[PDB]
Design a protein around this motif. Structure first.
Motif, PDB file in Angstrom:
ATOM      1  N   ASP A 215       2.379   0.213   6.272  1.00 14.12           N
ATOM      2  CA  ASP A 215       1.593  -0.330   5.177  1.00 14.12           C
ATOM      3  C   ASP A 215       0.434   0.603   4.863  1.00 14.12           C
ATOM      4  O   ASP A 215      -0.167   1.196   5.762  1.00 14.12           O
ATOM      5  CB  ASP A 215       1.071  -1.719   5.528  1.00 14.12           C
ATOM      6  CG  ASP A 215      -0.056  -2.164   4.616  1.00 14.12           C
ATOM      7  OD1 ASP A 215       0.181  -2.308   3.399  1.00 14.12           O
ATOM      8  OD2 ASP A 215      -1.181  -2.368   5.117  1.00 14.12           O
ATOM      9  N   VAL A 216       0.126   0.741   3.580  1.00  8.68           N
ATOM     10  CA  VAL A 216      -0.929   1.619   3.112  1.00  8.68           C
ATOM     11  C   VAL A 216      -1.872   0.814   2.226  1.00  8.68           C
ATOM     12  O   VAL A 216      -1.757  -0.404   2.108  1.00  8.68           O
ATOM     13  CB  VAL A 216      -0.379   2.848   2.359  1.00  8.68           C
ATOM     14  CG1 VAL A 216       0.609   3.612   3.229  1.00  8.68           C
ATOM     15  CG2 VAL A 216       0.285   2.414   1.063  1.00  8.68           C
ATOM     16  N   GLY A 217      -2.829   1.511   1.630  1.00  6.42           N
ATOM     17  CA  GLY A 217      -3.711   0.926   0.642  1.00  6.42           C
ATOM     18  C   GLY A 217      -3.398   1.461  -0.743  1.00  6.42           C
ATOM     19  O   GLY A 217      -2.960   2.599  -0.902  1.00  6.42           O
ATOM     20  N   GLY A 218      -3.630   0.626  -1.750  1.00 10.44           N
ATOM     21  CA  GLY A 218      -3.338   1.006  -3.118  1.00 10.44           C
ATOM     22  C   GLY A 218      -4.576   1.139  -3.977  1.00 10.44           C
ATOM     23  O   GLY A 218      -4.511   0.990  -5.200  1.00 10.44           O
TER      24      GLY A 218
ATOM     25  N   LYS B 154       2.384  -6.190  -0.691  1.00  8.22           N
ATOM     26  CA  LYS B 154       3.252  -5.380   0.150  1.00  8.22           C
ATOM     27  C   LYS B 154       2.964  -5.594   1.633  1.00  8.22           C
ATOM     28  O   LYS B 154       3.876  -5.538   2.467  1.00  8.22           O
ATOM     29  CB  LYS B 154       3.084  -3.934  -0.305  1.00  8.22           C
ATOM     30  CG  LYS B 154       1.674  -3.513  -0.076  1.00  8.22           C
ATOM     31  CD  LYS B 154       1.304  -2.149  -0.529  1.00  8.22           C
ATOM     32  CE  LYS B 154      -0.156  -1.985  -0.177  1.00  8.22           C
ATOM     33  NZ  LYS B 154      -0.962  -2.948  -1.029  1.00  8.22           N
ATOM     34  N   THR B 155       1.707  -5.864   1.986  1.00  9.35           N
ATOM     35  CA  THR B 155       1.420  -6.254   3.362  1.00  9.35           C
ATOM     36  C   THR B 155       2.115  -7.560   3.718  1.00  9.35           C
ATOM     37  O   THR B 155       2.647  -7.703   4.828  1.00  9.35           O
ATOM     38  CB  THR B 155      -0.085  -6.383   3.581  1.00  9.35           C
ATOM     39  OG1 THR B 155      -0.743  -5.230   3.047  1.00  9.35           O
ATOM     40  CG2 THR B 155      -0.390  -6.477   5.066  1.00  9.35           C
TER      41      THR B 155
ATOM     42  N   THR C 235      -6.002  -4.108   3.415  1.00 15.62           N
ATOM     43  CA  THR C 235      -6.031  -3.144   4.506  1.00 15.62           C
ATOM     44  C   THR C 235      -6.740  -1.867   4.080  1.00 15.62           C
ATOM     45  O   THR C 235      -6.555  -1.375   2.964  1.00 15.62           O
ATOM     46  CB  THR C 235      -4.611  -2.823   4.971  1.00 15.62           C
ATOM     47  OG1 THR C 235      -3.780  -2.562   3.833  1.00 15.62           O
ATOM     48  CG2 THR C 235      -4.034  -3.989   5.760  1.00 15.62           C
TER      49      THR C 235
END
Ligand SMILES: Nc1nc2c(ncn2[C@@H]2O[C@H](COP(=O)(O)OP(=O)(O)O)[C@@H](O)[C@H]2O)c(=O)[nH]1
Ligand code: BEF
Ligand SMILES: [Mg+2]
Lengths: 365, 349, 166, 442
Positions: C53-56, C16-17, C34
């Motif tokens: 953008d986030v972290g999963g 996704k990044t 990230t």
């Protein structure tokens, strides 16, 4: 948005700015090493890291970055608070090579910024005039000390010591009383002087009785600019204008946790914050100071003061289970500590706070 | 309690009790080990060790290095470095003395040798016993006593060859001889092993004294132009010289038997005893205790005096002590630090 | 009239990044996972699309709730190659859509990474996404690949077309 | 309501040192909540990055040195944080300068280490990849000499990957359990001396700063225990023992019962002035008929009553003072002012509290000795007048009383002998003494 401003002397600061959520200040100089967008890029990292808004009522959460990726030191104090109850706080930037300079000044910079923010939040409820009005004094105090203040390694070349003369009746009383007042004022006092060489000499002299790190927490005198009673420094030299009145705010000085004049020669500890020193004063003059033999005996008195202070702290801290009971012990404490003079007792107590704050209250405050 | 000598330096480098202490020069002075020291510092400068049995004498010949003999029936000549030479005639000798004016020196028999360590002359078999003493006499004469018989073996100056003829003999003493000294150019003192005190005239060679109203084994007698002082056992007795009687006595002396006594130049007399205690004494208008010096578990042989340094007193418990004045020693210590720091600079540099 | 806050989320190692980098500059660069978040925006058809953008990471799975404000479009990306933890992903999705905090925001399921023939057309992928099962939601999914860099455009177009009526 | 003193974590999809995995991390500080909290953007061959954390409920953060570990396997990601923490806020800020260097050396160890280890993995991998490439270029090449286009494409991809690996290995050369053991050891060492509070830590540096200037006067009590010593001050008429110990007279302790003798011979060793490079001239459990040389450089000794010797040792009564334990018999008659304050009826408790009292009050005499030894208007110029002025100087300036003066010039003699010889009484025996009378106390 940078508002370039200048001040006398070399620039230690490299920037200073603010923060948002869906840099207007700069040290105007020649050939800034890093571009304007770099300040913003650095500011985002320090700012875009809160997320977890775990604050009860509001306080300054001072951070500190030594980020050697580019060689920059960042200081900030973020608080919540307009339109929305968001969080935002100022920031200050220093270059990498000026590392050791800030460390002694942290405890005064944080207090200054905390008082600044506490003023800004007052006007937030009931935006930029105050922001720029209380940003130069903070950038003035730290910029002044770039090439002033007494360093740690000071010789006896320009001291009241190395004089070969004990002085007249007034000189001896003045010197003894000045040293007694300094040692009884926890080591925070500034000197007022009409002349320039006299004030610098006496200040450098009286600075011999402090720790080496404490030396950078000072302020040398000069006859060019107009300094202010910065209530976060220990020994500060200045010059008095020909008006006849010193610029000394009462609120700033009183909030601190003495007055010595070279002209009228009368020391007075009007705002608050002995035989042991009398002996040192009477004996140090009875030796030849040319061959440095008078320098060594200086250290012994300070060492005997530090150790006699530490033993009092330990005797207070073991008479109760690290604090579980009232003290209720004065005569016994005075008798066994080889200090029956009230002045000597106060002098010994004074060195204790520099290590363990609050002891005055804990013992009899 | 008044008295000098507040400091006490101790030296330990010997394996046996050494009974001889001889002056060497301005600053330097029974196992056959010869060691010299520095009076001020106390450092054992150099060392001499060539003997096998116990040593019998030590002298100086002003050059003026050393002259020592031992029980090995051989006399060696050490210097310091490299040894000079060694002399061995027949037997062993227990005495040695150097004649200044004649510029000659001499040793069961008597043998005189020149500066080349060569025996210029030597008498025949004098007696079955050795020479107990050898005292210089006026008019190039040598006087010696052999136990119960004393013969003044005069030496005739050098056609230029030295000669030696005994010119007198005596039998007044009824016992062996203990010691004899030449009190200036006046006379020669004689002492008997049984304790009889006698005198010998210088040129007349006529007995003129006999004192016996005192174990009577008087060992050493110290005298000058003024009066004669001697020690016998547990009492120190002074026999007058001019008036010819007993001038001063002290019955309650050291509990042991005295060994050697002497007179300090500034008019006092010190004592050495077998008990190990050495006490100083001052002459009065017809004496009293001056001080005490407790220094050893056992005896002490003899004491040598230094003009501005102190005393050397030990022979028994394998040691040496150099007693000092203290206070006067501190001042000399002070005037060498102040005069050094100025040349040096600061304290540490 | 131009703001569009997107709570772009996804599973671990979903790229996704890289999707955000395609949207911004259209170039492939290596990405370190990230940690906290990224802030970038893209303007398209007179509206600026703000994508965070986030972290999963599974530890920070119960952390996206702190980002559950100010976002109108709940764009979510689910992997298709990894035929594992799909039930866990579905449970996470239903748990992050069941609360009234995000009730105002409109759902937008999305997929990516066609790649190898193991993962094929979205019939069974959407079946395991259970599109017909949800009630009071909206969903519209495309098949997208980052290497070719095609598909995200029509996703943005659908977002615009179906959300500008408010 | 406490906090740990070390941590280390790598968050993707730990370790202790407080007391070698101490079990006490009381339930107010989660094991990984702070690890989640310290997970932050900072860090983006790289370089060091220091930081600090903020407060919370209820422990302040501390130095959170973040540094990449090595090249694993995502290409080089390795978020290794050597976080430190303490419950005293101001301490970390004040000591930051000293605290930084130790962690910096520790992390530099991992950098100069585990980088080499990745090293080997890379090496083998290429070695394995190169072996695969050789197998291809031999067998598959022969087969081509004997579809094959796919084999050639795979070989080209392998060659490209091999070139990438070669470049990465060449770059990783560059300056920029074999090593983990000493790194954990150094982390333990970092934990070692900071256990105490900041209050003691500040003094532990101020004093060390001061003592490097008093090089001359420090040799007395530089020291390179109390409860028993305190009880000696339950033992009456013990005061003159301190004066005898200070003045330079040997204090022989004579008696049986080895235990008590060893209890006192070291308890009273604090008061003994030194001589030089030798640590202390103290003799333990002497057994002999004794000699004078034995009293020279053994400042005090202990003998035993083999069940007397009072007459045997009483001959040397002018040089030493005799202590006998069981009979409580024991020095000149002394009416002073110095030592009574050094040991009183004191209400002080605890052992080490009195030790610091003595250590503080002893250096005052060291300073007094320095003054007396190095004033020029006294030693410089008649014996009567110089003695009178020396004896009268201490009556007025230094404020001493009667016989107390004696110790001062004794210590002064130590200083002057030190300045030149540095070996007073070791190779040049001094053995100073006096003719003072004595007395015996029951
Ligand atoms: N082959 C292929 N790889 C992809 C695709 N989309 C993402 N990736 C991979 O995803 C990786 C990046 O994942 P990352 O950004 O760290 O995790 P994310 O941001 O949560 O998706 C890259 O190495 C890409 O190889 C795709 O469509 N095809
Ligand atoms: F690329 Be990360 F998963 F946000
Ligand atoms: Mg990712």
């Amino acid at each position: 948005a940078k508002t370039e401003i200048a001040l006398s002397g070399k620039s230690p600061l490299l920037a200073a700015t603010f923060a948002y959520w869906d840099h207007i200040w700069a040290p105007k100089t020649e050939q800034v090493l890093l571009s304007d967008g770099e300040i913003t890029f650095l500011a985002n990292h320090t700012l875009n890291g809160e997320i977890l808004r775990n604050a009860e009522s509001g306080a300054i959460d001072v951070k500190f970055f030594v980020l050697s990726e580019k060689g920059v030191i960042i200081v900030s104090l973020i608080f919540d608070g307009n339109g929305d109850r968001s969080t935002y706080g100022l920031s200050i930037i220093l270059p990498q090579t000026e590392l050791s300079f800030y460390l002694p000044l942290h405890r005064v910079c944080v207090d200054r910024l905390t008082h600044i923010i506490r003023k800004g939040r007052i006007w937030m409820h009931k935006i930029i005039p105050m922001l720029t009005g209380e940003v130069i004094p903070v950038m003035e105090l730290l910029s002044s000390m770039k090439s002033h203040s007494v360093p740690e390694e000071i010789d006896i070349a320009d001291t009241v010591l190395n004089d070969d003369d004990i002085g007249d009746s007034c000189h001896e009383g003045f010197l003894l009383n000045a040293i007694s007042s300094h040692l009884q004022t926890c080591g925070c006092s500034v000197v007022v002087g009409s002349s320039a060489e006299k004030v610098n000499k006496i200040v450098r002299t009286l600075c011999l009785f402090l720790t080496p790190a404490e030396r950078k927490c000072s302020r040398l005198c000069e006859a060019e600019s107009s300094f202010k009673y910065e209530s976060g420094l220990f020994v500060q030299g200045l010059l008095k204008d020909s008006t006849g009145s010193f610029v000394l705010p009462f609120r700033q000085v009183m909030y601190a946790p003495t007055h010595i004049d070279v002209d009228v020669n009368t020391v007075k500890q009007m705002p608050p914050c002995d035989t042991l020193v009398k002996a040192f004063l009477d004996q140090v003059f009875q030796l030849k100071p040319g061959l440095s033999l008078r320098s060594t005996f200086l250290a012994q008195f300070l060492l005997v003061l530090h150790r006699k202070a530490l033993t009092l702290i330990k005797y207070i801290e073991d008479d109760t289970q690290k604090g579980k009971k009232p003290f209720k012990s004065l005569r016994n404490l005075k008798i066994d500590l080889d200090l029956t003079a009230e002045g000597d007792l106060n002098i010994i107590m004074a060195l204790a706070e520099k290590i363990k704050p609050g002891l005055h209250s804990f013992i009899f405050g | 309690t008044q008295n000098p000598y507040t400091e006490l330096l101790v030296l330990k480098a010997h394996h046996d009790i050494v009974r001889f202490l001889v002056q060497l020069d301005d600053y330097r002075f029974d196992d056959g080990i010869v060691v010299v020291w520095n009076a001020q510092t106390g450092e054992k400068l150099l060392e001499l060790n060539g003997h096998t049995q116990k040593i019998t004498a030590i002298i100086t010949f002003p050059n003026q290095l050393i002259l020592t003999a031992s029980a090995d029936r051989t006399v060696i000549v050490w210097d310091g470095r490299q040894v000079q030479r060694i002399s061995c005639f027949q037997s062993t000798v227990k005495c040695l003395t150097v004649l200044q004016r004649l510029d000659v020196w001499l040793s069961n028999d008597l043998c005189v040798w020149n500066r080349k360590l060569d025996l210029l002359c030597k008498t025949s078999h004098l007696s079955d016993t050795g020479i107990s003493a050898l005292v210089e006499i006026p008019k190039n004469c040598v006087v010696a006593a052999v136990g119960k018989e004393l013969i003044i073996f005069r030496l005739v100056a050098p056609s230029l060859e030295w000669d030696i003829l005994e010119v007198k003999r005596l039998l007044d003493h009824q016992d062996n001889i203990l010691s004899l000294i030449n009190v200036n150019d006046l006379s020669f003192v004689t002492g008997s092993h049984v304790g009889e005190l006698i005198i010998w005239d210088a040129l007349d060679w006529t007995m003129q004294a006999y004192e016996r109203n005192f174990d009577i084994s008087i060992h050493h007698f110290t005298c000058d132009e003024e009066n004669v002082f001697a020690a016998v056992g547990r009492g120190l007795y002074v026999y007058s010289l001019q008036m010819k009687r007993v001038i001063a006595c002290q019955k309650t002396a050291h509990d042991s038997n005295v060994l050697h006594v002497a007179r300090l130049p500034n008019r006092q007399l010190i004592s050495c005893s077998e008990d190990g205690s050495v006490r100083i004494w001052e002459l009065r208008e017809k004496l009293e205790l001056i001080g005490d010096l407790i220094g050893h578990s056992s005896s002490v042989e003899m004491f040598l005096y230094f003009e501005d340094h102190g005393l050397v007193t030990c022979s028994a418990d394998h040691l040496i002590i150099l007693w000092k004045n203290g206070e006067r020693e501190s001042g000399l210590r002070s005037l060498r630090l102040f005069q050094k720091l100025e040349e040096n600079g600061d304290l540490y540099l | 009239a131009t703001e569009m806050r997107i709570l772009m989320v996804g599973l671990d190692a979903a790229g996704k990044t890289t999707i955000l980098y395609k949207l911004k500059l259209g170039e492939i660069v290596t990405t370190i996972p990230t940690i906290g978040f990224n802030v970038e925006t893209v303007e398209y058809k007179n509206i600026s699309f703000t994508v965070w953008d986030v972290g999963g990471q599974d530890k920070i799975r119960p952390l996206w709730r702190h980002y559950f404000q100010n976002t109108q479009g709940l764009i979510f990306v689910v992997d298709s190659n990894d035929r594992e933890r799909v039930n866990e992903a579905r449970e996470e999705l239903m748990r992050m859509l069941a609360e009234d905090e995000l009730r105002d925001a409109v759902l937008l399921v999305f997929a990516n990474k066609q790649d190898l023939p193991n993962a094929m057309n979205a019939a069974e992928i959407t079946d395991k996404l259970g599109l017909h099962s949800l009630r009071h939601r909206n969903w519209y999914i495309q098949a997208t690949c980052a290497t070719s860099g095609d598909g995200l455009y029509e996703g943005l177009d659908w977002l615009s077309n179906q959300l500008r009526n408010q | 309501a406490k906090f740990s003193r070390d941590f280390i974590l790598i968050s993707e999809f730990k370790v202790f040192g407080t007391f070698d995995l101490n079990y006490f991390s009381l339930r107010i500080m989660s094991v990984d909540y702070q690890a989640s909290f310290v997970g932050h953007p900072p860090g983006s061959l790289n370089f060091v990055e220091d930081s600090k954390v903020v407060l919370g409920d209820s422990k302040e953060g501390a130095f959170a040195y973040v540094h990449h570990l090595t090249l694993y396997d995502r290409g080089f990601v390795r978020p290794f944080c050597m976080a430190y923490i303490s419950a005293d806020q101001h301490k970390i800020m004040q000591q930051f300068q000293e605290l930084s260097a130790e962690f910096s050396r520790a992390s530099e160890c991992l950098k100069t280490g585990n980088r080499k280890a990745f090293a080997g993995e890379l090496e083998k991998k290429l070695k394995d990849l190169d072996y695969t490439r050789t197998v291809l270029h031999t067998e598959t090449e022969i087969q081509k000499k004997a579809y094959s286009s796919q084999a050639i494409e795979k070989a080209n991809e392998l060659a490209s990957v091999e070139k990438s690996i070669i470049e990465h290995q060449d770059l990783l050369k560059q300056i920029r359990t074999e090593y983990f053991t000493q790194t954990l050891a150094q982390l333990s060492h970092i934990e070692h001396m900071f256990r105490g509070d900041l209050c003691y830590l500040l003094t532990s540096q101020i004093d060390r700063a001061l003592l490097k200037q008093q090089h001359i006067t420090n040799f007395l009590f530089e020291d390179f225990a109390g409860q028993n010593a305190l009880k000696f001050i339950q033992y009456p008429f013990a005061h003159p023992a301190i004066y005898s110990l200070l003045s330079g007279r040997t204090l022989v302790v004579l008696g049986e019962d080895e235990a008590i003798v060893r209890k006192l011979v070291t308890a009273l060793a604090i008061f003994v002035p030194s001589y030089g490079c030798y640590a202390k001239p103290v003799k333990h459990w002497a057994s002999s008929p004794l000699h004078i040389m034995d009293f020279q450089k053994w400042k005090l000794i202990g003998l035993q009553r083999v069940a007397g010797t009072l007459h045997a040792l009483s001959r040397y009564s002018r040089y030493t003072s005799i202590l006998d334990l069981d009979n409580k018999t024991l020095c000149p008659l002394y009416r002073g002012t110095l030592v009574p304050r050094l040991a009183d009826r004191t209400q002080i408790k605890r052992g080490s509290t009195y030790y610091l009292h003595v250590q503080s009050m002893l250096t005052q005499l060291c300073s007094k000795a320095f003054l007396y030894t190095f004033c020029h208007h006294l030693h410089l110029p008649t014996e009567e007048l110089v003695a009178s002025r020396q004896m009268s100087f201490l009556k007025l300036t230094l404020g001493l009383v009667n016989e107390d003066v004696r110790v001062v010039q004794y210590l002064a003699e130590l200083l002057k002998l030190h300045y030149m010889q540095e070996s007073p009484g070791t190779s040049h025996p001094m053995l100073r003494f006096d003719y003072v009378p004595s007395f015996l106390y029951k």
